[PDB]
Amino acid sequence: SSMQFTDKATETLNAAAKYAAENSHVQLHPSHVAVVMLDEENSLFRSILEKAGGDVVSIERGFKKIMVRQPHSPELAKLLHYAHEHMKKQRDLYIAQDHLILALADLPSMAQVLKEGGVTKKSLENAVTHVRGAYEALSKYCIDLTELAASGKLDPVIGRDEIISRVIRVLSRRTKNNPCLVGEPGVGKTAIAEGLANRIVKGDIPSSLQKKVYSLDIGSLLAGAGEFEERLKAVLKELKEAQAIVFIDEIHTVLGAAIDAANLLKPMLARGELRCIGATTLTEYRQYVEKDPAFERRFQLVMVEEPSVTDTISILRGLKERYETHHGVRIADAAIVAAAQLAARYITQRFMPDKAIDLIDEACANTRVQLDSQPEAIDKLERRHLQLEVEATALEKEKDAASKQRLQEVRAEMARIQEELRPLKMKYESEKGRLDEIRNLSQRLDELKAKAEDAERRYDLARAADIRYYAIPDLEKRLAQLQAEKSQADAERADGLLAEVVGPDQIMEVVSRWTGIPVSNLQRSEKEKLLHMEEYMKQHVVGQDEAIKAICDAIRLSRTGLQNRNRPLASFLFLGPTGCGKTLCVKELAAFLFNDPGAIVRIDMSEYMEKHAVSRLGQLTEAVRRRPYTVVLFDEMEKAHKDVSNLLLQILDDGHCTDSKGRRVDFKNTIIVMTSNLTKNAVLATARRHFANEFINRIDELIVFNRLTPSNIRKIVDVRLKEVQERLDEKQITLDVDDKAKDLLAQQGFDPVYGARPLNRLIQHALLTQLSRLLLDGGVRPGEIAKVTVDQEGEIIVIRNHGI
Template identity: 50%
Template sequence: TTLDEYRKHIEKDAALERRFQPVLVGEPSVADTIAILRGLKEKYEVHHGVRITDNALVAAATLADRYIGDRFLPDKAIDLVDEAASRLRIEIDSLPLEIDEVERRILQLEIERQALLKEKDKAALERRKSVEEEIAELRERSSAMKAQWQAEKAAIGEIQQIRSELESLKGEVDQATRRGDLQRAAELRYGRIPELERRLEEDERRLAEVQTKAKYLKEEVDAEDIAEIVARWTGIPVTKMMESERERLTRLEQELAERVVGQRQAVSAVANAVRRSRAGLGDPKRPTGSFIFLGPTGVGKTETARALAEFLFDDERAMIRLDMSEYMEKHSVARMIGAPPGYVGFEEGGQLTEAVRRRPYSVVLFDEIEKAHPDVFNVLLQILDDGRLTDSQGRVVDFRNTVIIMTSNVGSGIIVESGGPEDETAWARVEQRVRDELRQYFRPEFLNRVDDIIVFRPLSREDLAQIVDIQLRKLEETLAARSLHLQVTAEAREFLAQQGYDPVYGARPLRRVIQRELQNAMALELLEGNFREGDTIRVERAGDHLRLVPAAAVPEMASA
């Protein structure tokens, strides 16, 4: 039984307790788990009919220990091996993907051929001829592939049968030895078992020969299979990086800069943290990265977190966001980690801890941290240092695979006053003044645990021109869903950038300008039926406002 169950049911009855001798069984280490897995390996190989490599066992123990926090060794490592082996067994018994694709293509062409039989024109006859030729070619290819697959499957089946027989004979040897039937034990150990081992070796060699032409079946579980199961259980990418992902990670700065304009330092710091983590060089006891983003409103602090979430999960909403203005009271800390025992909501858990338990690989955004009560930051200390947090029910939540981003407007007055000087020396002085002001708000032990404090520059007119393009691209996507196209002249773009430029408020006024000058007029035109599906809306500047005209009605467009 577990310690909790023992305390609850047995310890309270002293008469019952003294009739038992408690034996404490601790969780085995990773090395012990590997030894346990090696002992179980043959039984699982026979049960699933696949071979399990030693590096798969090592990967199961190490990855389970590193990434699966809510269960114990060796149980979680055994489950990984079991699931990876059963998945491979199902793949062996199912039709391989390559053959399945050819079969589906044949079926598709057969349907097309039947439809063409009713047609009598020349084009249909020619098409039918080419379809029949393709069907014949694909059938030939399919039969060759199936023959290869059946040969592999038969060889693997024989190997599985011999392994199963070997396992039962080894069990019989043990039984014969125990009951003293040494003649039977010797007969099996030195006769039948070596013969089966020789046959197994021959069959494995024959399988290797069959697979030299083509390989449709994989009959051994390796470390990559284990990593795939871990990735599926936890959502943490621990599999080997594909070439496409390597390329994306090397140009992560460019990908983030497409959305976050004019903040090279912030983008670079976040990109380096993600690369360290995926390359396996990050500190295994701390979060992937922890940052404080400082700067005036509307310069891209929250947008950087959104862009990172979109890069990692292909969805900018896949981000755990806590608005710290909701944590202004001292007692609101309980909302983060859960209410203490005896209080309402004890069973529900905390907003932060529950979200990270469900998605251990995520971007956690603490927005506008200066608005929170100072006691909230005591909770963050062990997250930043140890990558863990204990919730109100005593469960340890793992933060080691999260990127922690905290945003703040502290010192934004200093940045706006300075106007974001181009000169690096002058900017370094501004940064120092902002950091000094930050130290007045937060304790040294909190700031000392953060990986990097990044000061965002105010947006220049050139930056805003780029943001105009980004915002208009989003509007184009919205219109494309209604089969409409957008064409904005250079003068109109310049007008939007001029109207939306405000160094104090950043890029947010631009969104309001686009709504006021463009979207309001566009909504009215669409409701009046002036633009229909397939039309191109051309946006031109007309003095101190914008004008919408159908692109077809503009004569110079034809020559353009």
């Protein structure tokens, strides 16, 4: 079969040959293995022989005299054969340092010295029983990052030049030589250390740093039992004699705690004999590092800031080739820029670039099913042809007068579908083996690029010379030929053009599914929304012509660049009597600018008026972090105390709020609206007296609402009745109201002392009430134009045409 040796057992024969090379030798004798094991720190070859007795000095001096009499040794070949034959005999436990004792006892040349020294053959059986129950521990319990980086099996790291260069300066210092990538679970922490190992093999690191990178696996050390001390001390011992830097993912879980494991890392990091790279969360960083003064002396605070929209585009360019090989699709250049812009304006689940890679992975995977499992444009014609083909065959075997007339109608519709199905079915059969071959020819070239780079880095210019110069240049012509012939054949079908190339329309499909926003709202750019904004608000809110213009004057000045980046979108302060357009105006703002009416939070002052609820403005801080584009509404602002306005002062001045967990929520693209119920000159001066002199000056626009005018009442009934007809279009019912009925409901519902609330209640309790009465007995049938006019006694009645 095949034998498997650890890294410690492999270097044992190499270290034994190094000691024998200085004494002029041409062969490696198995006696050199016992000499190396007796010169280690806390070896196991000495403690096991002590239990059985004997004299180790008489045995050690006997093994040293055998190597002197020496002129691959013939006796060494028997040791390698016994390790392969006896590898399937005992029970558990692989190979280590204690298992090599029984391999040397089977050699006749080594058994004579043991019997003449003290420990006989029968004593070796009971000695290995009580003790029973990258190096050795760095291979099964740890993963070397530099091995996978030099072998071409690591994802490229593009966009971390300002972070990797800082870690190098920390490791070169005398004190505080333990970096800690303090960030958030979503901004990238493990991939940062991946780029550092790439510069080690290339030689971009200074001469002061020559260590390696080892990923300490936490879940691997907890495998089994009690017995955790034997596994943790073995890793720290191998890293001291080899001089290497270990990487610890999530240090807050292993350092600071069930089984005490942080006690073995404190003396190592204090004497400078160990270098660790931390990568925990800022939430748990203040409870396991800053709490203990001894840990701050060795760890340095390294902040990890989330990249902006400019750096995110360059990150997706590095992983673009990785998805073009597995998914087997062609990623366009326009889909990369649109991915970084749509990942922070509609959906928000993590941070950059974590919340931007999932959009490319999901879009490239959707095309895999829509091409190999028959596209929708092709399967639609096959399903319609399947229902007609099975019906035509049933009439041919039945001789009847009514079967011949029906067969002519089915054949007339079958020939039209078959005429367009054959060019699509025959082309789909040829593209099935061609599209699947592109993925097969790409996955093999990806593996060849990894094996070619590994040979050039491990000093082996004999194997990589036939890959980069033969195996790759001779295969790029076939892969590029199939991709060119596939794109030309897709244009002949006149359908499914965006089913194989991930473009701007493909990214918008994933975002529209994970939320509910229609596709028509995704193509609308931010520039076209600010132009047609005044015409949209007037269609829903009428009468306040002086208030709509004031809203656009505070938003357009924050998007062009005529104001510093220290204030949010626009801070408003609605006043006037009740029922003037304070709640409806807020709902219409998110339905156009934010394209999400349901993303409007309402924090009432009925329960947050007390002083104990001021710190939860925190519940409001955590709520706005999940959804950036949100609408924070402040209802009943006149009842709030002075503690609420004092907390919101630092937000409008610094652009962000101080989080309790040390985080930072961006309050730049967040609207600030309020609601208050406080001719118009004395009303505005009243609200400025209750608040501070500084809070009223920071507010940009101070819109003061007024009562509804009788001239605007006629426009209200013209746009309110339109929504009723739109809800009845599914039943083919046309709702038409004459000019007589529009004037009766406008002169009765006029109540400026309370607002427009009794307005719609009068229509529902008269017009909408009698309209639904005829929809049950048989008055208004789905398919007749309804007429509503004024009767002879003055009452809104629906004219009917059918009886009960």
